[PDB]
Write an enzyme that holds these catalytic residues in place. Sequence first.
Site, PDB file in Angstrom:
ATOM      1  N   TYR A 197       1.944   0.037  10.447  1.00 48.70           N
ATOM      2  CA  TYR A 197       0.808   0.929  10.611  1.00 48.70           C
ATOM      3  C   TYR A 197      -0.393   0.540   9.773  1.00 48.70           C
ATOM      4  O   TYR A 197      -0.267   0.196   8.601  1.00 48.70           O
ATOM      5  CB  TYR A 197       1.233   2.361  10.287  1.00 48.70           C
ATOM      6  CG  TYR A 197       2.265   2.893  11.255  1.00 48.70           C
ATOM      7  CD1 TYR A 197       3.623   2.838  10.957  1.00 48.70           C
ATOM      8  CD2 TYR A 197       1.887   3.400  12.490  1.00 48.70           C
ATOM      9  CE1 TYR A 197       4.577   3.270  11.873  1.00 48.70           C
ATOM     10  CE2 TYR A 197       2.831   3.831  13.409  1.00 48.70           C
ATOM     11  CZ  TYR A 197       4.171   3.760  13.094  1.00 48.70           C
ATOM     12  OH  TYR A 197       5.105   4.169  14.012  1.00 48.70           O
TER      13      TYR A 197
ATOM     14  N   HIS B  63      15.579   4.201   1.095  1.00 50.65           N
ATOM     15  CA  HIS B  63      15.474   5.478   0.378  1.00 50.65           C
ATOM     16  C   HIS B  63      16.799   5.948  -0.189  1.00 50.65           C
ATOM     17  O   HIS B  63      16.833   6.582  -1.237  1.00 50.65           O
ATOM     18  CB  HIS B  63      14.956   6.571   1.291  1.00 50.65           C
ATOM     19  CG  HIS B  63      13.544   6.377   1.722  1.00 50.65           C
ATOM     20  ND1 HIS B  63      13.036   6.949   2.869  1.00 50.65           N
ATOM     21  CD2 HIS B  63      12.530   5.677   1.162  1.00 50.65           C
ATOM     22  CE1 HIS B  63      11.766   6.610   2.997  1.00 50.65           C
ATOM     23  NE2 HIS B  63      11.434   5.839   1.976  1.00 50.65           N
TER      24      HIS B  63
ATOM     25  N   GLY C 147      10.570   0.991   9.162  1.00 51.82           N
ATOM     26  CA  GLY C 147       9.669   1.502   8.149  1.00 51.82           C
ATOM     27  C   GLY C 147      10.265   1.471   6.755  1.00 51.82           C
ATOM     28  O   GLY C 147       9.860   2.265   5.906  1.00 51.82           O
TER      29      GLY C 147
ATOM     30  N   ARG D 274      12.027  -3.797   3.050  1.00 55.81           N
ATOM     31  CA  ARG D 274      10.877  -4.494   2.512  1.00 55.81           C
ATOM     32  C   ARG D 274      11.388  -5.756   1.830  1.00 55.81           C
ATOM     33  O   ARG D 274      12.584  -5.886   1.591  1.00 55.81           O
ATOM     34  CB  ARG D 274      10.166  -3.590   1.507  1.00 55.81           C
ATOM     35  CG  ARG D 274       8.775  -4.039   1.130  1.00 55.81           C
ATOM     36  CD  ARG D 274       7.731  -3.124   1.729  1.00 55.81           C
ATOM     37  NE  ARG D 274       6.395  -3.337   1.176  1.00 55.81           N
ATOM     38  CZ  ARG D 274       5.845  -4.528   0.935  1.00 55.81           C
ATOM     39  NH1 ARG D 274       6.505  -5.653   1.188  1.00 55.81           N
ATOM     40  NH2 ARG D 274       4.611  -4.592   0.455  1.00 55.81           N
TER      41      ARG D 274
ATOM     42  N   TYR E 142       7.653  23.885  -4.098  1.00 57.69           N
ATOM     43  CA  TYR E 142       6.585  22.966  -4.495  1.00 57.69           C
ATOM     44  C   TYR E 142       5.718  22.477  -3.341  1.00 57.69           C
ATOM     45  O   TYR E 142       5.231  21.344  -3.366  1.00 57.69           O
ATOM     46  CB  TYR E 142       7.188  21.756  -5.222  1.00 57.69           C
ATOM     47  CG  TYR E 142       8.141  22.118  -6.341  1.00 57.69           C
ATOM     48  CD1 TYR E 142       9.508  22.276  -6.101  1.00 57.69           C
ATOM     49  CD2 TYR E 142       7.673  22.338  -7.630  1.00 57.69           C
ATOM     50  CE1 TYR E 142      10.380  22.651  -7.117  1.00 57.69           C
ATOM     51  CE2 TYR E 142       8.534  22.712  -8.650  1.00 57.69           C
ATOM     52  CZ  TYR E 142       9.885  22.870  -8.390  1.00 57.69           C
ATOM     53  OH  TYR E 142      10.732  23.260  -9.409  1.00 57.69           O
TER      54      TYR E 142
END
EC number: 2.1.1.20
Lengths: 292, 292
Positions: free
Chosen positions: A194, A142, A137, A175, A21
Amino acid sequence: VDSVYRTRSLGVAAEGIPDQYADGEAARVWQLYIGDTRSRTAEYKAWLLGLLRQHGCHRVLDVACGTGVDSIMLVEEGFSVTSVDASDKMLKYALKERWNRRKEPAFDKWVIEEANWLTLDKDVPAGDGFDAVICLGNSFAHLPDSKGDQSEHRLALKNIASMVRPGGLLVIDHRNYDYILSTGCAPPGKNIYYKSDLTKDITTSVLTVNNKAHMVTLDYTVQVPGAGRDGAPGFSKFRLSYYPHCLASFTELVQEAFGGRCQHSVLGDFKPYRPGQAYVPCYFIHVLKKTG
Amino acid sequence: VDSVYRTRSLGVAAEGIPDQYADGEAARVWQLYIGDTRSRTAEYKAWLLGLLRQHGCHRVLDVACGTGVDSIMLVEEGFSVTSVDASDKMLKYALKERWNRRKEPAFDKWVIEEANWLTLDKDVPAGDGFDAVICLGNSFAHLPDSKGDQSEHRLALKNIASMVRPGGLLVIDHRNYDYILSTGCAPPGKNIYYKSDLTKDITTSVLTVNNKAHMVTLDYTVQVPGAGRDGAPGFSKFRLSYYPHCLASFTELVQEAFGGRCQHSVLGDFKPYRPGQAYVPCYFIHVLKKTG
């Protein structure tokens, strides 16, 4: 009986033809995304370096290498960095970077390897450990929780703490899911690491299994610059998922990974944090020192 | 109404986690397969090196790079070789190899780029063309026929020919599909290029659209050496498809690419080939000298 018949198996490659993909409209826009996030922030650059120097750190492990943005910065600043990631799709970009600037001594001594948090202890030779280990980050978010309990979570954090040498540091963030969970909305373009030059809208979906936040899915509708007619832009979409880590729970986890022998302090965005403060940060940074 | 939800889009990656189908049962056996298909054969080495020197070739382009096996050998033998492939999952293997040997001047000057036959002219700056262009290993067979009319096959073959400088070469092969098609069987482990240390069984499936062989699918059942109990070997499988190219048609196709201005010669396995000859080759190597 119905049957499905595919050309080639899921996972294999073949000379001459793109991988499964690689050219989807999603992989396309995503490349715009992981790209757009390079414009490192001054607040971010000054903060990390200061922290590191202030502690005399030198050899540092980056456990969320990604395309290598945070690592290149430590590399150019004289640190002896070894970078690792589990995603080859993202690792390919760091590797390209190293090879280009390979003529520079500092980049020739940059170690980039593939590793997984779940098996980190056996993938990367800690030796005596590292000065600073970093996971920035909102990358730890995840790792989903497949087993129900946060076993996998505790395993990754334990291994991650393993690479930190005694008297060493661990800088890991997440976060502000405490706020996202209560609003149901995760403000876009809201970043501290960023500066985003890309424009996007964000649809926040939250899956609450029986009654416990289990996952936050974000759908990014990125406005791509010149994919329209007379200059107008186009709008492609892509999706990512995260585990809603609360300040309190995470704080219990990260500390428990050090067995209790550690120094914990949680920063608001980049400034200190004190519960009850009017300011609600987008990110919660945890800086732990290994005291034992 | 029904609906389906994915964690992340097909084709995107995330830092702490392995890419989509990187750890499937099939991807694991596949890695073995490509990793046990490198023991180069002397006939090949001599044949290839000889043909290239016999024609005084120096700048070579490998369009079916793969893990780099063919190219490494050429880089090792002083040739100026630039290697390209459209598969990152595979290119990744040649890049790594280059790094590990980046200290040897020859390996420092080895260009490994990403490119697609379909757009080869756009991805690689031929300049005045390369001395030789190779596409061995039956790699062209990988490009399927999606449109029904071999348009793509033609385009691919056009771009590829255009990388060849006048008086230059183009070496490109394909398996003996004529024989396969009539037997419905493609003998396994029968390679001329490399010696396979792996033990595998092969089931051949031929998809014949209206009345023209349109595809050939192979399901490799590899006997993994120690995935059993008391030393016993495990058994896992993967599949890969090819476009059945017949000598007669592929021959028209390859010349058609040079607009006719070329010298064509099709070799048996490595020895010359003449119809009706008793020996049935496994591969058909085509050498086309661009005469203008």
